[PDB]
Paper text:
Titin is a protein expressed in the skeletal and cardiac, or striated, muscle of vertebrates that plays various roles in muscle structure and function. Encoded by the gene TTN, titin spans half a sarcomere (the basic contractile unit of muscle) and has various functions including preventing sarcomere over-extension (Gautel and Djinović-Carugo, 2016), acting as a molecular ruler for thick filament formation and as a hub for numerous signalling molecules (Kruger and Linke, 2011, Linke and Hamdani, 2014). Fn3 domains are only found in the A-band region of titin, where they are arranged with Ig domains in a pattern termed super-repeats, which themselves are repeated. Fn3 domains have a characteristic beta sandwich fold, with a core of hydrophobic residues as the “filling” between two beta sheets that pack against each other face-to-face.
Fn3-3 and Fn3-11 are found in the non-repetitive region of A-band titin near the tip of the thick filament, Fn3-20 is in the second D-zone super-repeat and Fn3-49, Fn3-56, Fn3-85 and Fn3-90 are located in the 1st, 2nd, 6th and 7th C-zone super-repeats, respectively. Mutation of Arg27839 to glutamine would result in the loss of the salt bridge with Asp27804 but may still be able to form hydrogen bonds with Asp27804 and Tyr27813, depending on its conformation. We also characterised the effects of three further rare missense variants found in patients with HCM: Fn3-11 Ala16872Pro renders its domain unfolded (contrary to the predicted domain structure) but is still solubly expressed in bacteria, whilst Fn3-85 Ser27083Pro and Fn3-90 Arg27839Gln do not affect the folding of their domain but reduce its thermal stability. Although Fn3-85 Ser27083Pro and Fn3-90 Arg27839Gln have melting temperatures above physiological temperatures (47.0 °C and 46.8 °C, respectively) their unfolding curves show a proportion of protein unfolds below 37 °C, which may point to these mutations playing a role in disease. Gly27849Val in Fn3-90 was co-inherited in trans with an A-band truncating variant. Conversely, Fn3-49 Val22232Glu and Fn3-90 Gly27849Val were insolubly expressed in bacteria and following attempts to refold the protein after purification from the insoluble fraction, were shown to be unfolded by 1D NMR. Mutation to valine at this buried position introduces a large sidechain facing toward the N-terminal PXXP motif crucial for correct Fn3 domain folding. The disruption of this motif is likely what renders Fn3-90 Gly27849Val insoluble when expressed in bacteria, and unable to be refolded. The predicted structures of the three variant domains suggest they can in principle fold correctly, with a slight clash between Val27849 and Ser27766 in Fn3-90 Gly27849Val the only steric hindrance observed, but calculation of the change in Gibbs free energy due to the mutations suggests all three destabilise their domain.
Numbering used by the authors: 2 to 102
Amino acid sequence: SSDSPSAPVNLTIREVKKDSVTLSWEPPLIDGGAKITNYIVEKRETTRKAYATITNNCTKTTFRIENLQEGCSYYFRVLASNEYGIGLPAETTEPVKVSEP
């Protein structure tokens, strides 16, 4: 059916620093019609409407988002992609505040 992938599994915030966040995830349970080729990582400030893509070419299952706004709260999304399209996102349930510990 040439389906796209399902959502990445168990998206985890691995690290939260002053203005960066490291995410990790497990591959989707459904690759669809073809193998996973790349992951798309996105951010959204709690005060913005639209998600901003950080990278569309993440090939590992972990990624560090940098140059965030210290003191700002964010949602993050990771989407899985195969040759046939982009799947549904895995998203952080709570917003993450980046700040110096």
